[PDB]
Design a protein around this ligand. Structure first.
Ligand SMILES: OC[C@@H]1O[C@@H](OC[C@@H]2O[C@@H](OC[C@@H]3O[C@@H](O)[C@H](O)[C@H]3O)[C@H](O)[C@H]2O)[C@H](O)[C@H]1O
Ligand SMILES: [Ca+2]
Length: 296
């Protein structure tokens, strides 16, 4: 049943599949109410072999594990490459580079331990100055294309991407502005299914999830419509999409948890995702019941 975790508040889920298990990473909401602001210090890790029963692994990483960060364990994403696990995170940078930043940690296993892979930020606020806000450099998504080129996607208000080196911890080209995403807010997730690329994102505010399709990782991106309605009792809508055991899953968050779930006290949920024959995605139907076990 959704929400899937009832002893903690979890937000901004990311997932990956590794050796027949799905690993789920989420920020932990620790705000005492829904009237002040997000309080997030650490990210939690969970895993499942059936998408229904989840093992808790505990905190895999903390914002303070980056010596150059102030705190704020915001949206993050993990990807496997060459037997390692790279965890791209959003954190508030210390005063040396004011504003939010993207950092990267690395581990030898999906449950870590993880450590700062650079000793400094990968993206700092001052690298991107086409907007005056100091929270535009948040919410990273990393994708490795069929030719072996990795890309870092990110942004709030301004969607952007850049090539990553094969070492996964350095940029390898210019930062590009992404076009084709109407009402872009945040939460980019990129995935590929058959011969189409999909870029889904939080759209407008209060946030829906919209998406665009492209014939290449570079687009051009063609908006296809609404993937998720505004989520129950939350103005932020943050998604991850994965394939597991021949089904597709839409992992997201709501404010439907207890006690007093809400905008700063969120809860991860999961529902199934379905494709149309033309490659478009049916709009999600968010449900109390959630998904049935799907064991291999
Ligand atoms: O006002 C509408 C949209 O809100 C912002 O995006 C959503 C929020 O962005 C992040 O942080 C919220 C802001 O960042 C903090 O530094 C700033 O003080 C908060 O206002 C969260 O992910 C969302 O709540 C866009 O700026 C705007 O279009
Ligand atoms: Ca910036």
């Amino acid at each position: 049943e959704n929400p899937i975790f009832t002893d903690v508040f979890t937000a901004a889920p990311a997932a990956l599949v590794h050796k027949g298990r799905v690993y789920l990473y989420a920020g932990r909401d620790e705000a005492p109410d829904n009237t002040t602001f997000f309080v997030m210090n650490e990210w939690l890790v969970y895993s499942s072999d059936d998408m229904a029963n989840w093992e808790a692994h505990g905190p895999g990483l903390r914002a303070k594990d980056f010596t150059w960060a102030k705190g704020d364990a915001w949206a993050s994403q993990v990807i496997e490459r060459n037997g390692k696990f790279y965890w791209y995170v959003t954190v508030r940078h210390d005063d040396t580079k004011p504003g939010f930043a993207i950092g990267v940690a690395v581990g030898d296993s999906p449950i870590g331990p993880f450590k700062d892979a650079l000793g400094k930020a990968l993206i700092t606020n001052d690298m991107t100055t086409d907007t005056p806000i100091d929270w535009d450099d948040i919410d990273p998504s990393v994708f490795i294309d069929d030719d072996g080129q990795a890309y870092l996607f990110w942004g709030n208000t301004r969607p952007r991407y850049a090539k990553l080196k094969k070492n996964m911890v350095e940029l390898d080209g210019p930062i590009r502005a992404i076009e084709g995403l109407p009402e872009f807010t945040e939460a980019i997730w990129v995935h590929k299914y058959q011969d189409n690329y999909y870029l889904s994102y939080a759209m407008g505010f209060p946030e829906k999830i919209g998406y665009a399709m492209g014939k290449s990782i570079k687009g051009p991106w063609v908006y296809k419509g609404i993937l998720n309605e505004v989520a129950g009792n939350t103005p932020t809508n943050h998604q991850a999409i994965i394939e597991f055991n021949n089904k597709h899953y839409f992992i997201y968050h709501t404010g439907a948890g207890r006690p007093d779930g809400g905008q700063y006290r969120r809860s991860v949920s999961i529902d199934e995702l379905f494709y149309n024959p033309d490659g478009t995605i049916k709009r999600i139907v968010m449900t109390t019941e959630g998904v049935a076990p799907n064991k291999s």
